[PDB]
């Protein structure tokens, strides 16, 4: 996240950290995710696209740090990895960028509710906040697009949603952004999501609830003027999520 503040998982207890194991002894961070129900985590397809071997990923819940433990954390295996059929990538955007991971603990269970582990809510059919709403994104992504490592402490920031009219202006992203995407920026382009934040949540309040409105997907650079962050519009995928969960 560029800008933002450092936080702990108590402030984002639905955030999931997804890592990949390597035949060598190392485990590396991949992308972030969110818990929808006790056994399901949601993220982005482009995070798995190149190595869709479920057996090699580990998911941790209740994690405030990247490579050190947090007490109360849970580790899971991906029992199912569902990527989107119709997932495309162009010279910038990713279309249908949503994925589902069913988790299983080494004891046969799914997530258990705690002060560091909670689920986040889904919107209702094509229901989103109005542009202007301030939402928060969270994650371990880069703190500057030129860095090459990720932070060790969880971060968070608040960004606002903008309209498609504004995001599809030629000097922004033109028609690379579609109605199944949402754009969010800082009025003064100071904070934004960045590489390493993909799959993670864009939460906003809707009808009283903290709802998962978007999933970090792409963006040109990080915190660049007139280059908003683009997210997957969760409210447009409800049918899809449903047919699988």
């Amino acid at each position: 996240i560029i800008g933002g503040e450092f936080t702990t998982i108590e402030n984002q207890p639905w955030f999931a950290a997804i890592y990949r194991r390597h035949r060598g002894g190392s485990v590396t961070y991949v992308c972030g995710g969110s818990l929808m129900s006790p056994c399901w985590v949601i993220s982005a397809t482009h995070c798995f696209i190149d190595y869709p071997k479920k057996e090699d990923y580990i998911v941790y819940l209740g994690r405030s740090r990247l490579n050190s433990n947090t007490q109360g954390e849970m580790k899971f295996e991906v029992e199912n990895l569902i990527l989107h059929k119709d997932y495309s990538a162009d010279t910038l955007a990713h279309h249908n960028d949503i994925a589902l991971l069913k988790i299983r603990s080494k004891e046969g269970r799914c997530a258990q509710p705690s002060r560091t582990i909670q689920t986040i809510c889904l919107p209702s059919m094509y229901n989103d906040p109005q542009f202007g709403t301030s939402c928060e994104i969270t994650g371990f992504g880069k703190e500057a697009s030129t860095d090459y490592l990720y932070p060790e402490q969880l971060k968070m920031t608040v960004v606002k949603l903008i309209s498609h009219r504004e995001c599809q202006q030629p000097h922004y992203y033109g028609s690379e952004v579609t109605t199944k995407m949402l754009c969010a920026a800082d009025p003064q382009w100071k904070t934004d999501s960045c590489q390493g934040d993909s799959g993670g949540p864009l939460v906003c309040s809707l009808q009283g609830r903290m709802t998962l409105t978007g999933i970090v997907s792409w963006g040109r650079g990080c915190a660049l003027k007139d280059k908003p962050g683009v997210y997957t519009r969760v409210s447009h995928f409800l049918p899809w999520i449903r047919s699988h969960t």
Binding site: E10, Q12, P13, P38, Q118, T119, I120, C121, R209
Partner: peptide, 9 residues
């Protein structure tokens, strides 16, 4: 106790 989506404690 049980999950309550959206809640922080």
């Amino acid at each position: 106790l049980k999950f309550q989506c959206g809640q922080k404690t």
